[PDB]
Amino acid sequence: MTKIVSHRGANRFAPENTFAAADLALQQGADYIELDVRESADGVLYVIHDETLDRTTNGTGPVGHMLSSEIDTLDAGGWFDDRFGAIVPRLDAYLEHLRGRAGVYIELKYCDPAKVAALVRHLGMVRDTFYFSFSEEMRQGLQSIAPEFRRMMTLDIAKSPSLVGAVHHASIIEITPAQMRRPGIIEASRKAGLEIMVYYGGDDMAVHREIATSDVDYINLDRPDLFAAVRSG
Amino acid sequence: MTKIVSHRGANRFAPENTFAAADLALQQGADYIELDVRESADGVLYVIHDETLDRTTNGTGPVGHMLSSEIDTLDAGGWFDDRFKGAIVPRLDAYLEHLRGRAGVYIELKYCDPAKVAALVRHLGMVRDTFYFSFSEEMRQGLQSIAPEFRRMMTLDIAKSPSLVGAVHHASIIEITPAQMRRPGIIEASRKAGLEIMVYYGGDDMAVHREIATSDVDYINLDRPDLFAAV
Amino acid sequence: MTKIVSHRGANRFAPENTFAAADLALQQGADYIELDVRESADGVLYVIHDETLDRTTNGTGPVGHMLSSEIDTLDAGGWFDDRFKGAIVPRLDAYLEHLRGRAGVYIELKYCDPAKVAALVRHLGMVRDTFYFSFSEEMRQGLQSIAPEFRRMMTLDIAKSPSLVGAVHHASIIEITPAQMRRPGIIEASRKAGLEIMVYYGGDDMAVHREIATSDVDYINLDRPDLFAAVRSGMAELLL
Amino acid sequence: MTKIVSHRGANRFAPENTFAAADLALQQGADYIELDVRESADGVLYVIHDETLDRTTNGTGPVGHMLSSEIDTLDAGGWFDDRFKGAIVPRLDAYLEHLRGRAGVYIELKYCDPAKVAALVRHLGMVRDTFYFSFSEEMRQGLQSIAPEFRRMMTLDIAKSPSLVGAVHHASIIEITPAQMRRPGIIEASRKAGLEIMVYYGGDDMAVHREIATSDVDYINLDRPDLFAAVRSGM
Amino acid sequence: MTKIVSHRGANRFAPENTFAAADLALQQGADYIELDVRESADGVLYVIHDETLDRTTNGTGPVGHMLSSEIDTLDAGGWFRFKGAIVPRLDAYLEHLRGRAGVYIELKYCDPAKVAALVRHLGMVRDTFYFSFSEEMRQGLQSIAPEFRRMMTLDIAKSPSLVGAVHHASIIEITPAQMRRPGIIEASRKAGLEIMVYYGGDDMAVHREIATSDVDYINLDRPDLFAA
Amino acid sequence: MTKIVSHRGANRFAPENTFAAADLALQQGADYIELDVRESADGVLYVIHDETLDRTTNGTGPVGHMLSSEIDTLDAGGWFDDRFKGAIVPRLDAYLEHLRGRAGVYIELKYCDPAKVAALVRHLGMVRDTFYFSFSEEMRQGLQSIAPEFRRMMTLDIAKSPSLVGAVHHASIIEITPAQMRRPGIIEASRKAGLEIMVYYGGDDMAVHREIATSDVDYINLDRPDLFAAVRS
């Protein structure tokens, strides 16, 4: 049965990357929660997609340039609705809060891979966690510090299912719906012994079904509720 | 339920690292089969333990100095029982193709070329059902560089602590002696670490076998598949 | 005398990267066959240049997304000429075996598993007569830690300086444009560095071929073995 | 002015590797404190020398097979004296925080997770006033790839030459025996390489201490802070 | 106290990357002399910024394609009282500066092994730090000389806590705008980093700002002003 | 034909690793000169085998602990014979300078800075005419990381199989013993692996010399060039 990976939490009904967005996703049936990591000017791990506070908080400028004390005081939920001054979660709490409740797909944006390794190791969440990053710097870093961690590569970058493990040292391959459909793509990913996650952040119930129907291990989506119902069938 | 890992195949009643010994262990309920691998003078991958041929074949000297053509000649069963005269020193090549689909494989690199092992396993598509280890640092470094994604294991005697099996030795699997399986905190520390757990037994004591089947262990490295299957 | 490196076979008279373009190249006096490698969806090493099958086959899309079983189906000659209707997309497998004992091979990795390439060559015993290159930094580093000892080359365009081919790029062979060949100190620096020199041309100006054949150059990476071979035979006589 | 490095603390008057030993050393004049890092079965960084609890605690067996829960239960002081019956096995956690701002710290990894150490140190902002070493190659290489910016030392016995401390061992500090210190070439060669100089001793000969203080050395890896402390003052 | 790093000498008063621009700046109170290094076709280190000879020489083309011999010929003073000024070999330039100042070496494109050997030989490790916009040059030197001092700009590291943890540098460089921002210097100090500020701006009003700030180095293009 | 590798120089007629012992070797027709490098306390690369200055000089103590200034002033010939009174321990600097153009150089690192070696050989343009080795894994890993290009040898004793001389020890040259040279499959395997072959002897049983010279061997690591040389003529 395909597991649900919630892309930045219950994105459509709660401020992305918030305990609320996260808690909501767990309610709608998400099996995993995806988050994005960044580091404050003073070395603290936070959950936030953008490089700057602007788009999703009461603050502005590079998160890398701000100290945590200030960051910990920003509003990260009012921009969505007044019903939400949610905090820019610290990977510290955000993870401890998720531990035991779900798996976490951690995507490094820019931070210290060592701190991530040390933390995940401290919490004992190695098995139930997997990594990725568009930053080559981050991948190599995490690849050198934590080879044993589960990581994933996109077919888009790997060029071939056979190279996801061989070249990108990953055990999970992310493919689009178009790639999911191509006959050999799944058989190949399977020959390579990869878990398979398909990315789709839309509303087409049909697409959700077709995925819940295919030989796929995960779905990285922006609407867990929909896929959860389709999985109901 | 604990999975069975046949150490050198059912060697108590068959020649170790032989198709016979392996098919035997397989028939006695083995879930995985463990191999020993070395490379010939001319780069061929063989399933043999000792560095030399003397002990388990009718040949002599270092395996690294004999051509594959001469090796495929030797008898790898005679020394054991007369009932084993044909017994060849299997080629990792053919040995894995055979097991491919009948069981899992635990490949211990004695001394060879990691690249050829990774090329081989990736071609047979046996990445998910195999794991590695070596007492040679050189071999582990090579394999670690060539195939980080590969599942591997470290023993507790080397890692010093379960918290270091993955963190320091990049292992996903931890192997422990039955004694260590007894220490209350060891199995728990390993689970905290998220490692798979395997115990090396291969004894006669059917009680220990039942004790391990009882504990929260994932695999049991064995010399007597027969016994454990019953339990 | 200068050695000839056939750029993806005698491509001007045969479908590039094809057993046909290669045999032609051999018959025409080439000492090395240059070939491009990519990997199928299921990990089979193939000889083909483009990322997609569209141009040199009757198939379409990325090769990385198609299973070798269907790939072996395609026709890699038909597009060049009716004479080549059933040319297959060579499996590095067969190709290298067919070339072993017949020529040297210059293997350019486009995108594939370095481990498989190194493993295959070590098995055929072809490490002395093959050299590598790749435009993909990822492929280069992969092969650099997997096969530090293989023979490799770097372009001056990338190395910036002959002295950096081996120093920074770990290569023992430098590739140069005809223009850089003419620069007085380039061939000399490369010589001080202990590098083998290769000039990439592949045009059809007889003058250039004769010039190159006349310079202090070890190899000529070209598109027309027929031309350079003539010029070279001419040199051979004088050599007598 | 030669700075003093207290090897496992004032181990000559207090149970080694305990806060008691650390504060005592601080008082005898210590500039730096030396620890040894091990790791519990569940990944908690502890300050204890031996691979086994036996010799310096009321616990027995490998430190790596025991959960922090039980370790935090041991008596790392009683064996030394009744005055210290209380003593606990210091978690690198708190031990470091307690020293931060009060003294420099020489961290010697026995066997543990380099990553856990590098993260802890960065989080505590103690990068600068701290330096590392280890006799485990596995440990040094682990730390070398994870934290190459850290300050670290190499013993001459291993580096063979002073010009190889940095070039081959990537170290910034060279440890020298009082003997090797005497050779006029050793010290000058070290300085040429831009190295810091530390002399390991831990002996009680006021004779030696005087000489070391005499020499052109930066640190002295001591076992008797009081002795050299007195000698330094006089100068 | 804040030290002065001369961005390839007093490039404003004398031909950049020259013994002249080095002496002048050194005389004006400069503490360090920043220099740009490239390698000739026959492998000789040379101080010159651009990849091509043109801009600051009577010779043309890439430096990488010219033999040291012919390069030694060129005059890198003309284009600026100076005329016979030569393109300095890192050999002489480094020996010439030893004992008189620190040296900030910025690798443009060359062999890190040659640089490390040279600096190790000359006993100049402690008084020198590195950088390079080239990932290749940085990884090369990082693997060859982990111990050398190096800097990463905040522009690239994104966070002060990442200058050492990710780019393995002990020196962080920043702009004045960044210098002005509160918690930046603070975070930089927590990471135990040395702080350098780039500013080739004559606004003597900012030179005053920097001076009063908690900086360690000032990589200026006009030493004189800051010296005042 | 077989190239001659003068192991430490003409051993029975001139103090090992000396200018005198090298020039003498060249006369007996040596093609290559094997050296042993060690670094002086102050960073100078010298040519000397032992870790200490005892056995081969009038000085004493580990070479690494003595400054170059001093070492330069020592006597490396008197120990051998009054004839070589004054022989100096050769800096790899001038020793390579002196050999460039007249011989191949087998540079065996004992314990020094691989970068210093690397830079030197690069500057003197002697990359093609030299190959390397070291029993020290520490030295081998460093040279390997700094100069993968350099040609290097590995003994079959260590590689366990000619097929691993390249694949694992990244070397193109395999040094074997006469004993192994006699074993059938060996030399052939080495050829299948495209390896250059070198045999170590240093003995004086001139029968063997010819056995080696009549074998498919490219190099001979000798103690007596004079002998093998004449067997060559």
Side-chain angles (χ1 to χ4, degrees), chain C residues 46-209 211-219:
Chain C
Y46 279 103
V47 163
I48 180 168
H49 180 281
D50 286 12
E51 197 180 83
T52 64
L53 307 155
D54 298 79
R55 183 173 124 273
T56 72
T57 75
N58 63 315
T60 193
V63 324
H65 298 185
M66 188 188 279
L67 288 172
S68 58
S69 237
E70 174 172 36
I71 296 182
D72 286 343
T73 274
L74 298 182
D75 150 50
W79 65 279
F80 186 94
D81 201 63
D82 281 41
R83 300 156 61 199
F84 311 100
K85 211 77 160 201
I88 67 177
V89 174
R91 285 199 168 194
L92 191 58
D93 241 334
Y95 210 67
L96 240 41
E97 278 209 297
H98 175 66
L99 292 181
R100 178 178 62 185
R102 288 190 178 88
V105 195
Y106 163 22
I107 292 170
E108 194 190 312
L109 306 192
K110 288 304 181 180
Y111 212 75
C112 55
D113 173 14
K116 306 197 180 60
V117 175
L120 171 68
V121 173
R122 242 112 74 156
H123 278 136
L124 298 174
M126 303 178 76
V127 185
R128 269 320 82 174
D129 311 287
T130 51
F131 69 82
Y132 312 70
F133 169 79
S134 177
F135 285 100
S136 179
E137 213 172 315
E138 185 121 55
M139 296 310 289
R140 254 186 264 134
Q141 316 189 84
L143 189 72
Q144 181 59 46
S145 74
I146 299 173
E149 74 288 10
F150 281 18
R151 288 169 63 217
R152 43 175 61 74
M153 91 74 180
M154 195 55 250
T155 57
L156 182 43
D157 291 342
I158 297 170
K160 299 305 192 175
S161 157
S163 74
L164 303 181
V165 177
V168 167
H169 297 273
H170 332 296
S172 50
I173 296 171
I174 178 175
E175 169 178 279
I176 289 159
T177 70
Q180 311 162 320
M181 175 186 67
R182 309 198 180 82
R183 246 268 216 169
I186 289 181
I187 289 183
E188 288 155 53
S190 304
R191 282 308 174 190
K192 172 181 178 178
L195 315 169
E196 290 185 77
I197 305 169
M198 172 163 78
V199 182
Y200 183 90
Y201 181 44
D204 44 298
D205 187 306
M206 233 50 202
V208 195
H209 284 283
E211 187 183 342
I212 291 170
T214 258
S215 306
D216 181 42
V217 173
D218 296 297
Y219 310 73

Side-chain angles (χ1 to χ4, degrees), chain A residues 116-126 128-161:
Chain A
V116 170
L119 182 64
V120 174
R121 284 169 178 173
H122 168 221
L123 298 177
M125 309 182 80
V126 171
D128 307 297
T129 189
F130 73 80
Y131 316 70
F132 172 75
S133 181
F134 290 111
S135 154
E136 279 182 275
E137 191 71 79
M138 299 313 287
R139 278 187 276 145
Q140 302 181 306
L142 189 68
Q143 189 64 55
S144 175
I145 294 148
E148 1 74 68
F149 286 4
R150 302 159 59 203
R151 71 213 323 121
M152 85 86 179
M153 193 50 256
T154 69
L155 183 53
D156 277 340
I157 292 170
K159 304 294 182 189
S160 166

Side-chain angles (χ1 to χ4, degrees), chain B residues 39-44 51 53 60-67 70 111-114 116 138-139 141, chain F residues 137 140-141 156-164 167-170 180 183-186 188-190 192:
Chain B
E39 195 173 301
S40 60
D42 61 325
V44 175
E51 181 171 81
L53 301 156
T60 181
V63 56
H65 299 199
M66 188 183 279
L67 302 176
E70 197 179 343
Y111 207 86
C112 53
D113 174 13
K116 302 197 190 63
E138 177 103 51
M139 294 308 280
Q141 274 154 44
Chain F
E137 298 194 301
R140 250 155 46 205
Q141 309 188 74
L156 172 64
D157 285 341
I158 305 189
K160 296 311 201 290
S161 170
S163 81
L164 301 177
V168 171
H169 299 277
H170 329 120
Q180 312 166 317
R183 233 266 216 191
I186 300 188
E188 179 194 358
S190 296
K192 176 188 166 179

Side-chain angles (χ1 to χ4, degrees), chain B residues 156 158-164 167-169 183 185-186 189 192, chain D residues 39-43 51 62 64-67 111-113 116 138:
Chain B
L156 178 57
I158 281 190
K160 302 312 192 174
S161 167
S163 76
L164 313 184
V168 165
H169 298 263
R183 252 256 218 183
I186 286 183
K192 182 191 174 182
Chain D
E39 191 171 308
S40 59
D42 52 317
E51 193 187 271
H65 300 201
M66 189 173 289
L67 294 163
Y111 209 72
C112 59
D113 182 4
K116 297 185 180 82
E138 181 107 68

